[PDB]
Structure formats: structure tokens, C-alpha cells
């Protein structure tokens, strides 16, 4: 792919997301979603492999179904209200259909099945975009219609997402699949507080985006896609695997790391609304995510695995590609807990 | 060089000219291919890369001086000559290290060709390195699993590189090679058997040369024929350029290749595939100790230019 063409496709994805987050008309939100899908498919297939084609096809099918359901919901809302503005949806059936469509776009379980497959099929560069940038538009739409969202359906989807993400992450040895299941769990965490307080959803989204950017950029800097391949990184570059262990501990939600901020604030907001069983269950189920993160930390840094002889040649050379945002993303994802009262700026 | 340079207008097809070719002079052990390669490089004006050894990577990185065997290679050709069936896996470890060295060499050669435009004359290549491995397996020095690992590593790295435009092969026979070796002086080379050289020749003439002829032209010369550099040069100057997939290359694939060959760690990414063969699997304690020893070498601790011990200065503002 020509670099100019790749830049145009990336800018088209970003422009689709900005159209979704900027318009006041439902038709333009659907248009932005369509542009996002159109410009995302070739970005998924930048490196041509049968696995890449399979991932692109599955993603296209899922997003197409979700967009069709979303447009049907929009049309029904127009029929029962004569309105196109992004506001309190005036039909419960349309609200349910739109919720299902947006959950399918986000990958909330039981619409989670495509995420581990599409994430594994595509490269790390495309996986980062899929797991970070592709969550902005549906979350923004959900935040704009949080008033009309049926709390029961959203809470059930969030709890199922957390449970399924934790369970799926335990049986995975491919790093991309582990990241996909962690993303599913974190999306459930974000959508748990949508009916209660959207600013907490925004905070969780920002923290998750920083953590996933750090993790994916570390994986790219190590060129590792499996636990065994990542294990060798302790020999060539111990700093990368140590930072990866710290970021995994942060993702587990362990204080004083930044990953404690979203869970803590979410539990606070959900207890303010007299919901005590759901946040407790979510906190207890986060232990599975913490488990597979810890297992990875063992295989990567906490314990040293056997390397190969050819790493001696690799010792001499230094990395050429330089990701300028990696140190900032690592710092913001590990040492920002003393800065929670900054929550107000998101209001 | 990067995506920005390609966008701004720097295209490799402009740099390619009549003599922008990669030439690999192949041959059996001590076939005199080195002199032929040097003479080809001198007259055609191309750059000559001496065959990659154990310490080739040491030449490109750092002071250009070989490092210790414990640090750079952990293998010995002399030990392989003495004991080819050692239980230390020195044979296959040496073969894999030599394949990695030649992979780096090919990358440096392609880089030089795609950046400067000057042609390259290499001695053998990653495409010809499998001959030694097959000879070792036939002799029984290495087992089948080592061959499987070598094939797995090769099929992931060689595919991303263009085969040489010209394959010049010297065809000195086995008995003459034996005579040269027994007159060369090196006792370790004298320890080489006959079936090893015979299997090297068999592999060269059964798999490498036919497969290379399938892709591009394959010039062949005997001992007498290879001694006329003008004759060999004239053949290269009149070869049909249709041979090889290089005419099927545009600036897109050239940009991909130039991006790949400039990142050495990306070049050697799949060399250290996590296949736990006992012959190459270095233990955790030994890995830690050897890596610490490497890190304590002068200039090998920090990135190049930030090692104050080796005279690098202005580091505070650098």
C-alpha cells in the first residue's frame, strides 16, 4: 500500500469518527459509521494474508449487520417521532435495536465473538487502531443517548462482557487474543456506568486507551505476538519487558497504578445509585483479567525463559523505529492515580 | 529513509542502471570463488562483499573488529571440522549462525544497491547456504529436527528478498578440491572428509543450480574458465536482463524492501524463532551471563554515540 493512500485511509477513519462525534443528525452519524467501516477494511488488510482477509471479512460482516440494525432503529425512531436529532429516543423498540447495534459495534458480549478473531488476524499496527480508535464513535453515541438507554439491558451486557472477557483471556497464549479479551472486559467496565454517569465512562475510556496504546506499542517495539516470542525479550531488552509488567499490573487494576482510577470511580458512582451487588461482582470478576496479566508478567519479566543462540547477533543492533509517544503513554497509564480530582475537566 | 522520503519523491528505480545487479559467485569449499568474485567486482565496478563468516556482524556493528566467541556466535568452524558429530550441537549452531550472518549480509547488500545504486558481488548467499546444511544432514552430523528448524527459519526470511540477477558457479571437482585443501595448510580443513564435499557438490548441482536457473541465468565455469576475469565479465555484460523478478519490481515493492533492509532487527526478526532445539537453546543463566558480558564491552552498553567510555561526548545535549 502506498504511504499516501495509507494516510488517506487513516484520515478517512478519523474523519468518520469525527463525523459521528460531531454531527447532530442521525443520518450523518450512520454515514460516519459507514465511512469508518469503508476506510477500516483496507487498513485491516494492509498486509495481505489469508488470515488478514478472513479478519476483514468477519469485521465487515459484523459491522454491516450492526449498521443495518442502527439504521433500522433510526428509521423507526423517525417514524414514531419525526425527528432526526440525537436526543431522547421516543420508541422503546427502536432504543433496543439501537442498543443491540451499538453493542455489536463495540463488541460487547454476547456480540464479542468477532473481536478475538479480527484482532488476531490483523497485525499489531491494525490491532491497536481496532482496539483503541474504533471504540470512540459507538461510545460517543451511547453517551449521547444514555438517558434513553434501558439500564437493565446495558448492565446485563456489561456484566456478561466482563465475565466473558475474563474467562476468554485465561485460555489464550496469543498476545493479540489476550488483548482482545481484555478489551472486551474493559468495554464492559465502561458501559456499566453509562446509565449512571457518562464522565466516568469517558475517564475509563481514556485510561484504557492509554494502557492499550502503551501495551500495543511495547509489543510492536518487541515484535512479539506470542508468550514464547515475548519471553525472549528479557534478554535483548529487559526495560521493555519490565515496563510491560508494570503496564500489565496497571491493567489489572492494582493500586497505586493508574488502572485503579476507572474501577474505583465506577464503583463510587454505582454505589451512589444504591447498586451494591453489580459493582462487587464486577470487582470480583476483574480477578480473572488480573490472573492472565500476572501469568504474562511471569512468562515475560518476573521469570526468565530460555533464549536462542541467534539473539547474540541481535544484541549488536539498535532499534531504528522510534515511537515518540510510548514513554508518555507508559507514564500516564501507571502513575496518574494521584491526579484523580482532574475528573472535573471531563465534565 | 522512510515513508516521507518515498512521498517526497525519492524513488529507487531512478538509481537502478545497467550495472545495478546483485552477483553471487558460488562454488564448493576452496574452489577459488573469492578471487573470481573480487575480479568481477573490480572490472564491473560493483562493490565486493567477502563471504560472511562468524564475525561478519561484528564488522558491520561497532569497531568492525571480531568479538569473543562466547559473545558473537558461540560456535567454531574449527571445532566442526575436528568433531562434526559433537553433542554440543556446534555443527547446527554454526550453520544457523552462518545463515543469520548471510541474511544480514544480503540485507546490507540490497540496502547498498537500493541506496547508492552500485551493484554488489557476494560470495554465495542465503539461497546457497542450505547446501552445507543438507551435506551435514546427509553425513549425519545434524539430525532431522535441525533441518526442519532451518527450513522454518529460511521460509520466513528469504521470501522477503529478491534472488540475485546473476548466479556465477565455479565447478572445481571434488578430487581437485581435496588436493587444494591438503595443500592449503589448514589441518582443520584437511580433516574434511570426501563424502562431505561430494554431498555439497550434489546439493549444488541438484537443487541450487537448477532452481536458480528456473529464476534467472546461471553462468558456470570450471577451474580454468574461472581464471579469465575478462571472459566472466563479458558474459555478465551480455546476459538477458529478462532473467530474474527484478524487472517485475516497481517503486512500491522497492520501498517495502528498502524499509525492510534498513531495520536490521526487523531483518533478523524471525532468526530467533522460539523453537527449543537443544542445539541452539541457550539456558537462562548462560543467556543472562553472556548478555551482561556483551553489555560491558566498550561501546556496547548504550546506543551508538552515547557511550562516554569510547570517546563519545556532548551526551548531555545529545
Amino acid at each position: 500500500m502506498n504511504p499516501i493512500i495509507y494516510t488517506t485511509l487513516i484520515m478517512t477513519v478519523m474523519s468518520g469518527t469525527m463525523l459521528v462525534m460531531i454531527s447532530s443528525h442521525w443520518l450523518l452519524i450512520w454515514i460516519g459509521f459507514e465511512m469508518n467501516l469503508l476506510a477500516m477494511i483496507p487498513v485491516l488488510m494492509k498486509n495481505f494474508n489469508p488470515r488478514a482477509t478472513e479478519a476483514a471479512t468477519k469485521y465487515f460482516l459484523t459491522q454491516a449487520t450492526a449498521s443495518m440494525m442502527l439504521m433500522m432503529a433510526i428509521i423507526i425512531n423517525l417514524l414514531y417521532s419525526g425527528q432526526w436529532t440525537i436526543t431522547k429516543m421516543f420508541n422503546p423498540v427502536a432504543m433496543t435495536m439501537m442498543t443491540m447495534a451499538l453493542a455489536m459495534k463495540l463488541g460487547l458480549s454476547p456480540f464479542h465473538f468477532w473481536v478475538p478473531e479480527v484482532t488476531q488476524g490483523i497485525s499489531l499496527q491494525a490491532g491497536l487502531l481496532l482496539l483503541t480508535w474504533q471504540k470512540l464513535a459507538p461510545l460517543s453515541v451511547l453517551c449521547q443517548i444514555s438517558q434513553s438507554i434501558n439500564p437493565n439491558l446495558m448492565l446485563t451486557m456489561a456484566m456478561l462482557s466482563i465475565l466473558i472477557g475474563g474467562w476468554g483471556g485465561l485460555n489464550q497464549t496469543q498476545l493479540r487474543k489476550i488483548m482482545a479479551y481484555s478489551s472486551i472486559a474493559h468495554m464492559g467496565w465502561m458501559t456499566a456506568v453509562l446509565p449512571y454517569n457518562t464522565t466516568m465512562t469517558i475517564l475509563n475510556l481514556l485510561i484504557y486507551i492509554t494502557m492499550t496504546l502503551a501495551m500495543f506499542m511495547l509489543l510492536i517495539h518487541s515484535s512479539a505476538t506470542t508468550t514464547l516470542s515475548l519471553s525472549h525479550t528479557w534478554n535483548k531488552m529487559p526495560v521493555i519487558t519490565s515496563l510491560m509488567m508494570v503496564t500489565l499490573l496497571s491493567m489489572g487494576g492494582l493500586p497505586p497504578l493508574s488502572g485503579f482510577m476507572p474501577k474505583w470511580m465506577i464503583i463510587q458512582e454505582m454505589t451512589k445509585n444504591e447498586s451494591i451487588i453489580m459493582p462487587t461482582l464486577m470487582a470480583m470478576t476483574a480477578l480473572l483479567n488480573l490472573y492472565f496479566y500476572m501469568r504474562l508478567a511471569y512468562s515475560s519479566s518476573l521469570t526468565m525463559f530460555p533464549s536462542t543462540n541467534n539473539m547474540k547477533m541481535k544484541w549488536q543492533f539498535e532499534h531504528t523505529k522510534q515511537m515518540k509517544l510510548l514513554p508518555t503513554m507508559i507514564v500516564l497509564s501507571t502513575l496518574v492515580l494521584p491526579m484523580t480530582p482532574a475528573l472535573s475537566s471531563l465534565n | 529513509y522512510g515513508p516521507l522520503a518515498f512521498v517526497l519523491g525519492e524513488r529507487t528505480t531512478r538509481k537502478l542502471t545497467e550495472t545495478s545487479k546483485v552477483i553471487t559467485v558460488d562454488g564448493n569449499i576452496c574452489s577459488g570463488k573469492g578471487r573470481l568474485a573480487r575480479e568481477i567486482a573490480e572490472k564491473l565496478g560493483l562493490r565486493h562483499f567477502p563471504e560472511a563468516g562468524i564475525h561478519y556482524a561484528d564488522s558491520t556493528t561497532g569497531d568492525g573488529k571480531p568479538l569473543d566467541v562466547q559473545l558473537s556466535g558461540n560456535c567454531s568452524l574449527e571445532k566442526f571440522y575436528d568433531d562434526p558429530k559433537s553433542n554440543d550441537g556446534n555443527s547446527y549452531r554454526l550453520q544457523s549462525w552462518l545463515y543469520a550472518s548471510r541474511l544480514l549480509q544480503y540485507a546490507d547488500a540490497l540496502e547498498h544497491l537500493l541506496s547508492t545504486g552500485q551493484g554488489v558481488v557476494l560470495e554465495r548467499s542465503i539461497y546457497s547456504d542450505f547446501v552445507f546444511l543438507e551435506a551435514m544432514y546427509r553425513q549425519g552430523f545434524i539430525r532431522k529436527q535441525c533441518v526442519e528448524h532451518y527450513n522454518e527459519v529460511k521460509k520466513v526470511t528469504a521470501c522477503e528478498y529478491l534472488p540475485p540477477h546473476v548466479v556465477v558457479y565455479v565447478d572445481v571437482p571434488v578430487p581437485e578440491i581435496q588436493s587444494r585443501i591438503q595443500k592449503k595448510g589448514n589441518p582443520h580443513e584437511m580433516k574434511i572428509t570426501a563424502a562431505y564435499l561430494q554431498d555439497i557438490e550434489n546439493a549444488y548441482k541438484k537443487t541450487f543450480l537448477p532452481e536458480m536457473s528456473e529464476k534467472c541465468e546461471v553462468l558456470q565455469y570450471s577451474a580454468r574458465e574461472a581464471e579469465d576475469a575478462e571472459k566472466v565479465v563479458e558474459d555478465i555484460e551480455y546476459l538477458k536482463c529478462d532473467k530474474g523478478p527484478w524487472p517485475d519490481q516497481d517503486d512500491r515493492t522497492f520501498h517495502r524492501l528498502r524499509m525492510l533492509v534498513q531495520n536490521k532487527l526487523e531483518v533478523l526478526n524471525y532468526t530467533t524463532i522460539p523453537v527449543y532445539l537443544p542445539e541452539i537453546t541457550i539456558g537462562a543463566h548462560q543467556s543472562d551471563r553472556v548478555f551482561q558480558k556483551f553489555t560491558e564491552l566498550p561501546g556496547r552498553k548504550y546506543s551508538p554515540g552515547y557511550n562516554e567510555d569510547v570517546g563519545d561526548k556532548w551526551i548531555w545535549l545529545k
Partner: peptide, 14 residues
């Protein structure tokens, strides 16, 4: 005496 430091048998579990 030394730390256990995973071997190939342990590493092949992952």
C-alpha cells in the same frame, strides 16, 4: 542453589 529460572519443559507449557 541458583534460582529455578524456567527451563524448556516449563516454557513449552505456554
Amino acid at each position: 542453589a541458583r534460582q529455578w529460572q524456567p527451563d524448556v519443559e516449563w516454557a513449552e507449557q505456554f
